[PDB]
């Protein structure tokens, strides 16, 4: 379970991602359920000017004008938003499922769940209990040795953060670059004259008020997501958390003989701190020696 | 079950927000389907005049008019209502959802639950496990009184939340009241798409106008209620100093005149939870006297 | 859930009729926006048809101006008014377990009723363990010490029925005074005479002969439901339910000491009794000093 | 559930397969919607030339033009993408769920899981009935699976075929992705009925189709590169043998046997998921452990 | 459940049936989604001739032409694919759901299940007793009931023969008249008084798409034919009318179990195509010395 | 469920009938989805004649022509198929659902289940106080039910009449379908008289969905013919053996316990019809039907 294995960063990131997906879906829905460009030939008691063009030559005119006079961004913005949202979504689903980094999370979560609600921790401040305590101590030592050398628990996190930050920067730049070229009334000087007669036509993209407005809203939302990502990166460069400073536990437990948590164990403890400040205490409790000997002696 | 600390105000808030969201959804659904503008040129057995304009010049006329004539409010009111309603709904839920502030409320609620159910309180109100449980509850009460009674952080967050809600309510009422007088039926569009189409001035009729305007008033009305609730809210936390309680009535009630008058976060939480069921306060304050510790020790002894 | 016994027949009939009225309102709104509304034509006063010579957008301007300033306020937005009134009635009916004191007292009473209805010791005493009887007795003291001190829940149903009756009267008045304005063929004289060309016009509001009939049906429902609330006046006005006197149980059980409760305990007891005359007998056992003394002696 | 027996050459490939299925679905949907070709007869302040052709002869013109004047790839690209994607999925599907050998894989998985948490495993690292049953299961595995070939060959072909398919897909969707254009120049002979001989056509979904085709080219390149790396891994380890050296030297047991053929292949493949079940299997397969268990049976 | 009797033939048959049903569904979806034959009257600065005929007359022309010009395979092809697919799918999956052998299938399944995880079976094969004796006696009685009568040795044979015949017929028809699914044809309808013109040229819009799904379906039919031919070859090239527990005698220790023939032979031989050792788990009940040893242990 | 109370005849019947319903449904779809008669006015390098009729006068022409020009069978075929299939399906299951005759079948099912595998049955058929109690209870229940049921004929009359009605309906369906199947053609000729309004009197109509209707009707005739053949065969097998008296002659001769007599009327019919599912429950229910079993149970009570 990752409910406790998710800092304050990755609930706001998740909510903003879901909001972006909803915005993109609505934009694409409006793009599909519309009429798009509707162009007519420029003519350079009132009475209308009878253009005298059929209902198929007008379909050809509109088709050529759309994909020869409307810029790149204005015509596919929902697709670009959807793709970038997919990138920022499945760039935060790797380290929880990447190759070789799946079993360790489950093992650590199982250990944390198992070694939490026991009488020994409360009594810190018959044969079955002692045997279970010794088995838990041996398993904890074996697991801590297991996650002690190959530490894919910061490289994955740091890499995910770096990719997220780079994507945020590029997305903001691109979005703010061309969001000035999505206009309503374009002047398509498309030259197909041997068939449809008229030379230059004017065009009026239908959905170009929701396009710019949705682009501004999406740019603001992506700005918030990028600032949150930058702050999360800053927390990753504010203090070397590759080892844990088990000073509070050692001082306020009376069992100050446990080794200091380092590498993946320290990373997991620091992350769990954002959930509840007792899981690392539980691991340290089932990470000592004198208390283990006392448990063995009380087992008999 | 963080429901004990949610007064009648936070109960009406969810319902009013749901009503506003439903109104917005219906409005957007209506604006999506029905053809919006139907504009025609003007003349600025009586036979009908023949304009002689095709079925694409008519669509261009309609598209230009329904983007250069109809005002902003009438064009996009449902979206504004949806955004404002979502913001208002989110604001109230961000008092206990503050990152890292869920712990204090959870501890207070669980400690109150453990204090309101033990038989030790009734025994003191006139074995072996009883004294141990009473002593452990007293120790937990001291620990919460040590940590959960450190600073008035929570009472400094609800005040800000209520102030923000009031400011938003004033803004929403002002904007809607000022600009809900420009959603009209027969607007006049004077657009110079004249060489292309043929005629200069025209009249337009936003089909889904007389409905939307009516809906607006409903929203305005609903908004008032929410704002009004906030008003009474900004009288529970303003007319009295809710950061220093006084459990003198309960102490005189059960006889033990030894439980002190709590202050700061403990006082705020007690005085806020009391309005839901004003009896758990006495039970909670009961496990705050040295008589309880002495009785637990003697019973254990 | 678990509230099936807090409803006399009046509540059940009201729920059924309200569901039906909501269904009718939904169907009405679907019809009101499902098909072609008012169709209007311009009055023009060997056979030969008269050629009006009006296009297919001039006609839509005519129809839209002549079906928003000619049909009366009832005929146009009728189904919406029906839906609004149905929702108002539903909220008025189901607001007995939402207010704070209502929820608290209802929770306490429901818990006590569930505990007592499955009390084997109650049946054992009624035939002529250990501290479970004492726990039940303490729970009963808690219940009829918190709940049985005032009529907090007794005014809620004392006002909700009144409000529902007033609303029923108002609805009958409105839908019966303005139900003669839904006429099929209306005459609209709108002065859109320069744009379209012809001044006066006649209109047929196609979906009228159905809708008007529907209104009658709606009134019929809002009649029967109303009368139901009327009888709910009697059970709240016939004899003072402020006290419940289980005098019959005293003779039928052999223990002439069961208390005669009053106030909100009495109200809830009488109402639950109207749902089923089986909970009172079972719950009376843990309400007498004789049973407490018998349990205390049997412990010895 | 075959979740452990899946190297890095089994996760990214599956994900890219899902992506290919999605791209094909979107393309097929788009071709289902929209209108396709819209063609008009050419002339082989200016009033437009009145073509003056009915509304059914125009449908005849468009129907002829979009059948005799649009290239094979561009006319049916989404269907081809879907078919090729399903084909490349099916081959990988039977790799670990082959028709007539799924029993062996499940048996090996069950035996490995049982051997993972043996009570004597920790004792050797530092009550005989369960150990005896596990020893019997291990003996059954050594008798049946170790003598059984024709399991590594399946995982040889289920990577050999995909490489050829990837090369062919790149080749086919390489050249014929320059003949998916916008405007064509149809010159058909329907002149006695429609009236005009040569006409110009403008396929509607062509730019988006070209973009989606380039995207599918990139994703297929990724999948093919993953397959090529997997094949190179198979061909750059000679991993049809077992050499219990690390677990033996780390435990001290001097009776660890060497597995060949199917057991060796399974060990080498699962050796990417976690290098711990191999130690448990080696411990269960050490005859000194069996002798110690027999002595302790007293 | 009954999946135990499912050789490679059953897997291939189920898969190809799914594929054929998919192709037929995708065809009959488009069979009426788009518009069928668009036909216009032939005329037997370029300027377009004006036909001058209304919309209803054009609808009548199309209706007469695309029912007097398009061949009995170009028009109702998807329905033919669907009918043939249903026949070739319900011809199989009839052994397991036919009265007259459904009880036999149930008895075979129950006998397989009962003599599979017997507590004494572990001891007997590797090296409580009353239950094993009861199961053995019940199995023996069931075998004696099913000993005489090939009520199951001919059902599968006839099903395979039927599928072979249908495969040959389908690969004859659908490959002999796949030369008429075509684009523009020449309708020579005679409706001249009403519409106005005699000879018309037509274009069946979904032509060079049906004539490709046709080759796809012909390939799928060929594949299912190959699988059915191999199954038939397995059926009538080796003597499956009598089993042989030769390996059991030389690999278990009880050299007195007889060879069950007829229905028991067919059921055992078919099961052996899925997992051989399972038969061994029942072979312990095929020796009377096993019952004697069980009685001795119970003694 | 009395699935075992159903011969092969009703195994395929309530299957083939299902198929019939399917065809009907499809037809109804192709009756409401696709179009119908598109009739045009008759005229008794050329240019086409311009009829000069609008898109509503053509609607009135088509509506009158395909209501007074297309015969009754072709106008509504599919509804007839659905109704006839419904009649056959309803008459199919009026045996085990009628009021006042479901009880006997349920009692027979319960008794057959009790006696199918009973330790006393095996003990008597091989060559505990609870065992004796169960055997005595079974013998008492069997003795009660034997007098309870086998007095009338409410178990053979129902099936005989149901088969008779099904055969009659199959005959009628074949007659009607094979009779008026030469009146579904493409080009019918509507010489209607609406000329003061439209303008032309003699017009020709071409029912759009005609050939598909003829093909589906031939299919339905074939399937109903198969069902009729099955009904006829079952009828021959039901009225030739005189199943009102069943004697376990085979069981008596292969067991030698000549104390179970021959049942009569309804019990005989129920046993003989159960004989078409599994001839193992028959001997099982026959075993606890002799004085020897009750006598042995009474002796074992001591």
Swiss-Prot record, chain F:
Tissues expressed in: Expressed at highest levels in skeletal muscle, and at moderate levels in heart, lung and peripheral blood leukocytes.
Compartments (UniProt record): Cell membrane; Endoplasmic reticulum membrane
Disease field: Telangiectasia, impaired intellectual development, microcephaly, metaphyseal dysplasia, eye abnormalities, and short stature: An autosomal dominant, pleiotropic disorder characterized by variable features that include telangiectasia, gastrointestinal vascular dysplasia, intellectual disability, skeletal dysplasia with fragile bones, short stature, and eye abnormalities. Patients exhibit striking cutis marmorata in infancy.
Function: Non-essential component of the volume-regulated anion channel (VRAC, also named VSOAC channel), an anion channel required to maintain a constant cell volume in response to extracellular or intracellular osmotic changes. The VRAC channel conducts iodide better than chloride and can also conduct organic osmolytes like taurine. Plays a redundant role in the efflux of amino acids, such as aspartate and glutamate, in response to osmotic stress.
Oligomeric form and interacting partners: Heterohexamer; oligomerizes with other LRRC8 proteins (LRRC8A, LRRC8B, LRRC8D and/or LRRC8E) to form a heterohexamer. Homoheptamer; inactive, likely because it is not targeted to the plasma membrane in the absence of LRRC8A. In vivo, the subunit composition may depend primarily on expression levels, and heterooligomeric channels containing various proportions of the different LRRC8 proteins may coexist.
Record text about domains: The volume-regulated anion channel (VRAC) channel forms a trimer of dimers, with symmetry mismatch between the pore-forming domain and the cytosolic LRR repeats, a topology similar to gap junction proteins.
Protein name: Volume-regulated anion channel subunit LRRC8C
């Amino acid at each position: 379970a990752f409910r406790v294995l998710k800092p304050w960063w990755d609930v706001f990131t998740d909510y903003l991602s879901v909001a972006m997906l909803m915005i993109g879906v609505f934009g694409c829905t409006l793009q599909v359920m519309q009429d798009k460009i509707i162009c007519l030939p420029k003519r350079v008691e009132m009475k209308g000017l009878k253009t005298d063009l059929d209902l198929q030559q007008y379909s050809f005119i509109n088709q050529m004008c759309y994909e020869r006079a409307l810029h790149w961004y204005a015509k596919y913005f929902p697709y670009l938003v959807l793709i970038h949202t997919l990138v920022f979504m499945l760039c935060s689903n790797f380290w929880f499922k990447f190759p070789g980094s799946s079993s360790k999370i489950e093992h650590f979560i199982s250990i944390l769940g198992k070694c939490f609600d026991s009488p020994w921790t409360t009594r810190a401040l018959d044969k079955k209990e002692g045997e279970q305590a010794k088995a838990l101590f041996e398993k904890v030592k074996k697991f801590r040795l297991h996650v002690e050398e190959g530490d894919i628990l910061y490289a994955m996190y740091v890499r995910q953060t770096v990719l997220k930050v780079i994507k945020f920067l590029i997305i903001i730049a691109y979005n703010s670059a061309l969001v000035s070229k999505v206009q309503f009334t374009v002047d398509c000087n498309v030259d197909i004259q041997d068939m449809t007669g008229y030379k230059n036509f004017s065009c009026n993209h239908t959905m170009a008020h929701l396009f710019s407005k949705l682009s501004f809203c999406y740019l603001c939302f992506v700005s918030i997501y990028g600032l949150t990502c930058l702050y999360t990166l800053y927390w990753l460069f504010y203090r070397s958390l590759r080892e844990y400073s088990f000073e509070y536990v050692r001082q306020e437990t009376g069992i100050d003989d446990i080794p200091d948590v380092k590498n993946d164990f320290a990373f997991m403890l620091h992350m769990i701190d954002q959930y509840d400040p007792l899981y690392s205490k539980r691991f340290a409790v089932f990470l000592s020696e004198v208390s283990e000997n006392k448990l063995k002696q009380l087992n008999l």
